[model samples]
Target chain A: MHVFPRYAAARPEQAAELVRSNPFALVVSAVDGVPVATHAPVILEGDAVEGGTLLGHMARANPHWRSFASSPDVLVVFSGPHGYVSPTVYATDPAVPTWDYAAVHATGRVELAEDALDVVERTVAALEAPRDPAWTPTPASRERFRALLPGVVAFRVRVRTEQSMFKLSQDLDAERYARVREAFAADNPGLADLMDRSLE
Target chain B: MHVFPRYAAARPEQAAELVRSNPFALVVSAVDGVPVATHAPVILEGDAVEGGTLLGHMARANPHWRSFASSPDVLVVFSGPHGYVSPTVYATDPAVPTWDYAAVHATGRVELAEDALDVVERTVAALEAPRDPAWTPTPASRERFRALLPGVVAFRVRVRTEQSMFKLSQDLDAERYARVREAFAADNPGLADLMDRSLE
Candidate 1:
């Protein structure tokens, strides 16, 4: 991902928040120079995008993970709220259309984890943090997870570099920016909220 | 992406619809055997996923596109409505957590387009089709687009293989599926609506 200077995260925490809130990610690796990817849930282990260890898992049946040993270098893409921005929102002549979106691309080296169950439980904890009445596994649930563990594969990514783009019409003037934000608020509040935070 | 047999798209059209509706895609390619990706707006030129062409453009300043000639094999990923499903939604003992989501992965060889302006206009048309009072570029707007065209590079992917996963809990019994759907309806209606459509 190419991050234009103006579109880069205003602060490190901003990018970290986007990754934490949007944990389902595209994990990509190359085998014999051909790109292969899997969509899986990945949780950042630390606050920083760079040098962060990301925990993720996929199905053991997924041959994608089997290639990890040969190709540990990977790209994990986390996509946040995104939507098309109409030039009409600008209400200005000479305006062109664009997409307002947020995404974090983490380049890392993957190390297969020995314990899939541990990664699964930690992932559950991370996801459940935002729920009102978060679910905690009972003893029976733990047993079930154990039974299903054989089908899962887990890994840790030691992020070497991180790039992010939060291109939410930040280049627009204040008045035009407000219009675009308001338009998104009506139909795509998640993106609207991201734009709002970028102002801070 | 690994597609469990139970989670594959119900119809070929289902995957096509996903690509059309979620046009902003991650275009991934490898350079020197490492994964590189760019998030760009991509429109399907035809209704079919296989043997279809995907039109997309990115900023010329983004070096990611410059590598296409050397490594033209790319994977374009379109992500649809997705959310984490709490095991609580299942309301069954021994239930485990999972994420319900839909995505289409198209693998193909990319060819750089000669006319960036044409790709931009077509992309605008495709994106505006779903909107009421869709904005058509005025003469001034077209001029503006022309001025900006030099900084853009357009490309077309000759899609060879398409893989999609519509993993929206189709494995669950009818009763548990309904419970999960209702839960999503309360907080993530987009995902819930996808589940409803998948039932058909």
Candidate 2:
């Protein structure tokens, strides 16, 4: 993704936070000359859980994930809260309406897991960690989950570069920012809460 | 993009609605063998208005949009409401958690618009049409907007083929569907409201 200097975020911690909050991502790769993408949940790993890797799976029937094994690199995108920003919110008259949002782009080389069980366990851990009363796969449930494993392919990407953008009225002055926040609160209540929480 | 038969959406009207509701899209293309993407608001166009092209712009300094003139085909992704579907939402113990969502992938050749004023006008119309008190660009403001247009390049894509996926729990039983809806409502109120508004 091409990010303006004002919107670009190079901090690994910020990128990690965005990915964690929005685990579901678009995994993009090329098949032949055409671009292909898959929507899946990502497992993030690194030092201190900071710079490890991304683990994901796709059905064997899905050609996108399989292409990753042969492809030199893949792009994974994690999108965050986005909402319309009216030009009216800006204190300056020359201001035009824009959108405020956040996203992270992670590029890496693909590594297919040799052991199928390991892939399944990675997926289970990545997915189940965020839920309340966190659940684990019992032997019986694991068996059931593993039964379908033959139909799927799992792989991890050793990330080389991670870029993020958090464009939530950071360029606006305090008055304009407050107006934008208030407008979002009135027009898009849910997103307003998200914007508020992001502030915290 | 790959869409299973159950998840495929063939109706142009549905695709149009998705694009309109989710105007902000990721415009993807290959940049030096690597997939490059940009986020922009898109206006859908076609004979039926449902099958139309997309209108958007990129900053002049951004090489991604300039590359569009050479690479005719591009992918514009319109993402809709998505949320984690907990396994608990499923009635059967054999089921695993998944995500429910929708996306429209529009592929086509891009034609860069020479008239900067037209691009600015179209962009304003696409964004402001839904508002109660319609805001139109004034002569002075239009001139001001046009003056800034030199910094951005606007283009429209002639959509050739469109693919969409609505991965809601359509295959689930009625009880499971209700459970998923209720669970989404309690856990992801924002996504729940989106589902209610769009699918209910």
Candidate 3:
């Protein structure tokens, strides 16, 4: 990832928070001599390793899983709020155009698990816990879910290196950055919040 | 991109539309003998080849661009709306959990363009024109932007093979698919719209 040194997260905690907020990520790997990508919601398991671990599942029918035999390395990308940047908001003549976006990339050796129930359980809990009367696992439901687990391929990536980028308008002067932030706030609140949280 | 024939787009047109709607994409490629990815808003240009072409820019200071020697094969991913699909929505016990997502992967040879202003101009227009009083380029601003242009690298991707997948639960029965759509509508409207357009 091409992250300006200033845009790079100062600590792993920042990247971890970004992953939790945007659990849905793109899992990229090479398959059949070409790069293949799949969208999956992965749960971040910190302290499971020195860095962390990512848990995800794929349809057994997907040939992508089979390709991992040749290359164990996989890239799990977690993208946060992103918005189009118009020079109109730069409030400057030299400003051309740019986009304010942030993302975290975790790369590691992927190993497939025999069952996906535990992963599905953890993922469901992470996503549902925020809702009122969160969904709970039942004996019957868990048993039934087990029956369909065979159709899924669960994998864990023991993250070796993590890269993150928060490409807000840090290059701009504070006044211009303020305008860019304000413009984003009105048009892209999510992205605006990110820029707001970043440096001036 | 192990998209099942059932999940793959029926035509290249579908992938093109997905790319257009989700212009903010992850550009992935191998760097320093490992896979590296960057986020960029790439405009899709079709009809130049059997499939299509992609145009985008990157910061020169970011080493991700320099890592690519000659014509490097890069994967540009266009990820559309995605949401968690609860098994409860299936209204069945045997059902498992899944994340419904749509994405298009454009794998192609990447080449940096000599003139970036044209690429930058079109990119800004694509992202800004939808807004009120769309942004326009000016002589002073264009010339100012020209001076800083050396700090950026504009590139084009001559797409080779494109892969797409709209995993919107088309495998479900009509009644169940309708339920999924309804659930997504109430919880994740963006993903719901995608499912709504795909199956039911």
Candidate 4:
């Protein structure tokens, strides 16, 4: 992921926060000289002092997982609050239409986990965290979940490098930025809330 | 790119519609035995009768565009309306959690366009279609846009194989499906609207 200096965000904390808020990500790897991608939910762990790993999995039947055999290094992309920024949204004339979005890129070596139970527990923890009146897996439910583990392949990417881009209205003037932000809010309230929460 | 029988959608019309609604896509290619992915907006042309082409471009400084030398074949992925489906959303106790989303994969050979004007025109048309008071590039704006064209490389992918998956609540029972739809509407109105519109 090559980010321009104006849009680049090197802070690990910022990147981690974005990943945590938007857990769903695209996992990309090369398979038989072709690129294959799978969408999955990822949980970011660790802190600024000690960077953590990204956890996710794919169905065993899916060939994308097999791609990790040859290309152990994978790219996981987490995106948040993307919307079209019409030229009308900007006050300037030279400005062309563009999209404002925030994305974090994680490149690392992926290793498939040996214990299926651990995978199930990690998945449940990552997914159930955001839900209200939190749900826990019962013994029978856990067993059933573990039973399906054979049909899936769980893995973790030990982070080697992380890069992020926050392409908001940083390139525009204050008034133009306000206009863009207001247009986005008026047009997309949900995205506006996300942008507000993600403010640096 | 892996689609099960229950989730697979082979209709070309549906694929084209997905491309139109979700123009922003990830263009993936193999670079030096590694998978490199870039996000760009794609214009899907031609109807079901005559298979269409995927047109997009990338910054010239980006190495992914230049590395297409080994294999021009690239994957253009259009993803839409993905959300986590909680197990509780299903009426059945035996149900497991999964994601509901739509995705289209276009695989074809990429050829860089010699004239940047054509690419710019196509991009403007595709992206600005939804805006009111249609935006047409003026001579001055065109000149400026073309000037920046040197910093970018435009390419068109002559699509050979197209695959799509619309994995909503198709696998769930009628009662569970209704519940899931209602829950999505109550929580994610936009996604719910997308799902409702997708219903045939």
Which lDDT value does model 2 have at B164?
Answer: 83
Write the residue-wise lDDT of candidate 2 on B29-61 in tens digits.
777667777888877765433357788887788
The CAPRI quality class of candidate 4 comes to acceptable
Compared with the true structure, what per-residue lDDT tens digits does model 2 show for residues A56-145?
777778777667656757778889878878665654565577888888888878777666567667766766677775556667777788
All-Cα superposition RMSD per candidate: 1.3, 2.9, 3.0, 2.6
* Candidate 3 per-residue C-alpha lDDT over B86-158 given as tens digits, one digit per residue, 9 for 90 to 100: 7677777655566778888888888888868788778877777666767787888788878878888888988
Tens-digit lDDT track of model 4 for A24-125? 788887776556778877777676312678888777887777767777968788877688777766646665666777888777888887765676577777
Model 2 DockQ reads 0.47
- iRMSD per model? 1.0, 2.4, 2.4, 2.4
Q: Please provide TM-scores, in order, for all candidate models, with all chains considered together.
A: 0.97, 0.89, 0.87, 0.91
Report the first chain's TM-score for all candidates: 0.96, 0.83, 0.89, 0.87
- Comparing 1 with 3 on TM-score, the higher-scoring candidate is 1
Candidate 4: Cα lDDT at B138: 62
Better of 1 and 4 by TM-score: 1
Local distance difference test, candidate 2: 0.74
What's model 2's TM-score? 0.89
**Alpha-carbon error at B13 in model 2, in Å?**
1.7
Separate clash counts for every candidate: 0, 6, 0, 0
In candidate 4, list every pair of residues with a backbone clash.
none
Query: What DockQ does each listed candidate score?
Result: 0.81, 0.47, 0.49, 0.48
